[PDB]
Structures are given as C-alpha cells and as structure tokens.
C-alpha cells in the first residue's frame, strides 16, 4: 500500500526497494519568441532512482534530444521514466532487484506497472510523505553531470557518501531529506551553510563536504533553523 | 408463439419474463406464461415474496426444445425443465389455455425493444458463459461470480465471461506500453475482435448478456464485465464505423430500459463520464449521449 510516517522504518529493512522520483526528468525554460508569443525549450534532465539503505543512486541523465519531434512531453516524461526503471531493473542480477519500488508521484503508478508487467512480484508503491527529491539538482556535482551531458548517459552514485561508515541508514536518511529540504525551501541560504567554511572541503569522491559528527549536528541545527525561518518569512509568523 | 407452462404456483413471487413481470399469490391457480415471441432468446425470472434475496431465472430460446417450470420444495425455488415427449406437452399446454390460466406475453406491437436488447445475443454463446451442458437453458442469479472475480470460489456455477484487463501483458505488446495502454485498438481488434470474439456480433452480444443479467438479477460481475467492454470501445482510437453506430443504439436501449431508481448501483460515474467526455469516441455517441445527460444528469 502506500507509504507513510507509520511504515517509515520498512525503508531500512533488508527488502530491497527502490524510490523514483520523476520531477526532474522533464525540464523547460519559458520564453517570449519575436512575435511575442511563448515557447518552450528543454533542457536536459534525469531520473533519481534511490536505494535508502544503501545510499546508491541510479542518476539516468535524460538529454533534450529524447523530446524531439515529440508531442505531449509531460506525459511521454512519465512514461520514458518507466521505461528507463523498467530497463534498469532488468540489467540487474536477479538478487540485485528490488522487491518494491516507490515512486513519489502517484501519476507515475500506471506508467511504471505497465512498463513492469513482466515483474508481477515487484510491488509499485505511492507514498504520503512529500519527499524533497525535486531538490536534487541544487547539487552542485549532480547538476554539472545532467548539464554537460551530450547523450542520454547512467551515473551511479552514493549519495550518503561515508556517512554510513559511522551512522544508521535511517540517520543518513533523515540527515539527506533535511539537507534537500532546506535546499528547496531557500537553496543560497541553504548552499551557504553548507560551505562557509572554507577549511571544510568535499573530496574528490564525495556530493557533501567532509563534516565531523560534531560539524553536522551544527550544520543540522542550521538547516532546521533555515527551515523554520523561511516557515515564517512565508507565512509570517 | 410458444408457451412455458407451470405445474403450479406453490409460493408467492414476482415473475419476470424479459422485462415484464407480475405477481403471483401463494397457492394462486397460475399455469404459466404463453404467446411468447419465437426468434428471441428469453429469460424466465423470480423474486420470492419472502426472501427478496437471490434474484434468480433462466435464460432459454422456445427453438431449442419444450420448457416448463416447476417448483421443488426440497430446493426452494422454481426450476426450468425440459419435456421430450411432445404430445404430453401439446396436450398440457392446451388445456391450460383453455381453462385460461396463463398469462399472455404482453408485447405491445410497435415495441422493438426487446429485439434492441437482445440483438446479438445467441443461446449457444450464453451456454458457453453458463456452463451446464446437461440442459438446454442456463440458470443465472444475483450470487454468481465471474471467472474473472475467482482470480482475484465454486468453478462450476461461475458466468465464464470473457476476461479484459487493461493492465495486462494481453493487452500490452511489449514495447508498446504507452502506445496500447492509452490506444486500447490493438486489443479490442487484433486481440479480442479477430482473436478472440472472431466477430463484433459476438463480442456486442456477451455485451449485451452481461447487462442483462447486471439489471435483471443485480449481478456486479455482471455490471463490471458490461463497464469492461464498453470502455474498451471508447478507449480506441481506431474502431470500424459501423461498430460504433451500433454500440450507440445498443447503450441507447440499455439506458432506456434501466430503472432510474436503479442508476446509484447499476452505472459506474468513470466509465460514463470518461466514455462520453474524455475518450476518442466522446463524439461517436450521439444517441447515448443524448438520453444519459436527459435522464441521469447527475451521474455526470
Ligand atoms: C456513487 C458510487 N458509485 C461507484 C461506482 N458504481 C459502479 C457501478 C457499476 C460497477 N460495475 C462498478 C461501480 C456504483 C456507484
């Protein structure tokens, strides 16, 4: 069934599951043409397919080229995506696939269970919970990857980097969806903690900088902090 | 015109025989049913007086043999059965008519709805859908489920409709997923159509069964294989023009027929709304469409 704040922690179980989240995969800029009317123009994007035990992350960069000579994009979106997860899973070792997959829109249900027919034992899944997965691409290495993408390409990453090393899967979790929290509600604010520090750098390796466990409770502090603030610069109070 | 004499009348019941019915009172000196239409199929049905529960009949065509209904106490209803030998029935059924006591199908001539309804509907396809080889006539009634229900218990007394699912590998050729998933006319012409139905006569007249056991017996199964089919028509984007017209006429007769305080449990808002409004055959509809918005407004 769908998924919540009560069977929030079957996330960190041993069942492998995989979240899609499918905000980023069609992207546009609006814009005035000569006669004045209005136009779109693409510009590439990606899935963001997370195993939250693990940390992986499945980024299938979507180049413009897809949408050409394409009608009804925002539909055919959801339907590349299905088709891309769908061949995803099956590149995998059968052990390696996963048993539920939870996408974070529910208008990617059908689009991914038909694209899945074939895998009648893998659950689709909605959730309740309103992930900040969109906020994906306010990181700075993610986004570079999409941009200077001139085909269709897969990256995996792990977007916990280290973390794991030293902390539960549900804190690496909770530590992941504050940061893309706050990056979506007021992303320079949010960069800006990240980063004032210039002594506290990001390896080569990594998407965070490399925090002590006593750096990332003040950068969590700050992040609640920002995220209650812009709470109230929104709905002043 | 053919007859289908009653031994007699032991309990209290409505009887219906297509869409009319009349009641009869316990012990009531009633022999049956006669000047019934030769060339229809027909369905013979009961309510009992004291157990509105379990609406139950028999679908039968006076072509294939000689029918009478009797009832069975041990059992507690009325059955259908058949007389072989012919002189015994002659020979009952006139003296009944004589002694005047059957009622006389009451079919107003100008009426062609019962024809409307039952267009393409032939016995041989109902025994396919109603498995009971031993008998000539097929019993339906409000508790059966269909094939389909079982998968998601008694095979045997099951309506063997045939089975649509939209999210389905039949339905959806590999590599394809959007195309056949939001255009329906791959599977309702090369999969169902030349597949399966081999014709649209036959797919329109299990169209037509489900619907008619959906109203007259209250069956859901009956309801959901009736929904099924109509919106896998309106869901194709290529359907043979004279499929279309005649669908039209179809729905049109069906959404006369239906009891209006029956709409709240017999029509399904979505299909409807999204058959007339939003799908490629919005359009097509005319008839349907015109008598659906002037007597049930409100479902839409
Ligand atoms: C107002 C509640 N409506 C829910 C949908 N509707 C329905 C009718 C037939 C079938 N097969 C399935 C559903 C009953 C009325």
Not at chain 1, 114 to 140: C, G, K, Q, W, Y
Not at chain 1, 174 to 195: C, D, F, H, P, Q
Not at chain 2, 121 to 139: A, G, L, P, T, W
Request: glycine fraction near 4%; proline fraction near 4%.
């Amino acid at each position: 069934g769908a998924m919540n704040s009560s069977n929030y922690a079957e996330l960190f179980n041993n069942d492998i599951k995989l979240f899609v989240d499918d905000t980023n995969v069609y992207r546009v800029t609006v814009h005035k043409t000569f006669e004045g009317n209005v136009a779109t123009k693409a510009i590439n994007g990606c899935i963001f397919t997370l195993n939250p035990k693990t940390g992986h992350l499945f980024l299938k960069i979507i180049h413009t080229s897809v949408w050409a000579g394409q009608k009804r994009l925002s539909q055919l979106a959801k339907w590349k995506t299905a088709e891309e997860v769908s061949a995803l899973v099956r590149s995998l070792p059968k052990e390696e696939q996963p048993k539920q997959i939870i996408v974070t829109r529910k208008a990617m249900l059908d689009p991914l269970e038909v694209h899945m027919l074939d895998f009648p034992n893998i659950a689709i899944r909605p959730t309740e919970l309103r992930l900040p997965f969109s906020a994906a691409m306010s990181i700075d290495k993610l986004s570079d990857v999409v941009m200077k993408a001139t085909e269709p390409q897969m990256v995996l990453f792990n977007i916990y980097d280290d973390w794991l090393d030293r902390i539960s899967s549900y804190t690496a979790f909770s530590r992941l969806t504050l940061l893309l929290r706050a990056l979506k509600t007021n992303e320079e604010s949010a960069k800006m903690i990240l980063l004032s520090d210039p002594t506290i750098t990001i390896k080569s390796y990594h998407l965070w900088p490399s925090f002590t466990d006593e750096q990332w409770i003040t950068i969590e502090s700050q992040m609640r902090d920002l995220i209650l603030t812009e709470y109230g610069r929104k709905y002043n109070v | 015109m053919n007859t289908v004499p009653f031994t007699s009348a032991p309990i209290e019941v409505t009887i219906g025989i297509d869409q009319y019915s009349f009641n009869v009172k316990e012990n009531q000196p009633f022999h049956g049913i006669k000047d019934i239409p030769i060339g229809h199929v027909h369905v013979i049905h009961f309510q009992h007086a004291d157990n509105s529960s379990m609406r139950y009949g028999y679908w039968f065509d006076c072509r294939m043999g000689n029918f009478y209904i009797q009832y069975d106490p041990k059992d507690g209803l009325y059955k259908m059965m058949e007389e072989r030998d012919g002189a015994k029935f002659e020979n009952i059924v006139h003296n009944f008519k004589e002694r005047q006591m059957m009622v006389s199908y009451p079919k107003i001539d100008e009426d062609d709805t019962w024809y409307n309804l039952t267009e393409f509907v032939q016995m041989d396809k109902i025994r396919k859908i109603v498995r009971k080889d031993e008998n000539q006539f097929s019993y339906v009634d409000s508790s059966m489920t269909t094939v389909q229900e079982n998968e998601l218990s008694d095979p045997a007394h099951s309506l063997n409709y045939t089975v649509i699912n939209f999210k389905s590998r039949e339905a959806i050729r590999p590599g394809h997923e959007m195309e056949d998933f939001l255009d329906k006319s791959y599977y309702l012409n090369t999969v169902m159509l030349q597949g399966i139905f081999k014709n649209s006569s036959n797919y329109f007249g299990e169209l037509q069964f489900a619907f008619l056991n959906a109203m007259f017996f209250g069956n859901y199964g009956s309801s959901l294989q009736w929904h099924a089919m109509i919106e896998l028509i309106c869901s194709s984007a290529t359907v043979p023009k004279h499929m279309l017209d005649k669908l039209d006429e179809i729905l049109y007769y069906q959404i006369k027929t239906l009891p209006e305080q029956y709409s709240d449990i017999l029509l399904n808002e979505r299909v409807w709304n999204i058959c007339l409004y939003s799908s490629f055959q919005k359009n097509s509809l005319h008839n349907t469409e015109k008598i659906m918005e002037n007597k049930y407004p409100e479902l839409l």
